[PDB]
Amino acid sequence: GWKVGDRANHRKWGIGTVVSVRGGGDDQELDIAFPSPIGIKRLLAKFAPIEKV
């Protein structure tokens, strides 16, 4: 699934970079760093409004 360094386009926050991935592969939790001033958001990958790249 998701990997550190991946870029994600989020419906709300635009494009950001994955800085942490945890939980098991079936319930990944992502930290995604969006450019200033949004900062880092922590969210469950399941049902997240994100697309890779």
Author numbering: 672 to 724
Give me lines lifted from the publication on this model:
The PcrA/UvrD helicase functions in multiple pathways that promote bacterial genome stability including the suppression of conflicts between replication and transcription and facilitating the repair of transcribed DNA. An interesting example is provided by the UvrD helicase (also annotated Helicase II, or PcrA in many Gram positive bacteria including Bacillus subtilis) which has been implicated in nucleotide excision repair (NER), mismatch repair, homologous recombination and rolling circle replication mechanisms. This multi-functionality is reflected in the ability of UvrD/PcrA to interact physically and functionally with many different partner proteins including UvrB, MutL, MutS, RecA and RepC/D. We and others have recently shown that PcrA/UvrD also interacts with RNA polymerase (RNAP), and this interaction could be important for the UvrD-dependent backtracking of stalled RNA polymerase. The extreme C-terminal region of PcrA/UvrD is important for interaction with both RNAP and UvrB. In this report, we define a small folded RNA polymerase interaction domain in Geobacillus stearothermophilus PcrA and have solved its structure at high resolution.
To test this idea, we designed a new shorter version of the PcrA CTD using the homology models as a guide. The structure was solved using a heavy atom derivative at a final resolution of 1.5 Å (Rfree = 22.2%). The final model includes all of the residues of the native PcrA sequence (W673 to V724) and an N-terminal glycine from the tag linker region. It closely resembles other bacterial Tudor domains such as those found in RapA, CarD and Mfd. Interestingly, some key residues that form this aromatic cage appear to be equivalent in PcrA (eg W684, F705). However, PcrA also features a charged lysine residue (K712) in this region. Several highly conserved residues cluster together on the surface of the PcrA Tudor fold that frequently forms a protein:protein interface in other systems. The pulldown assays revealed that each of the single mutant proteins had a severely reduced ability to bind to RNAP.
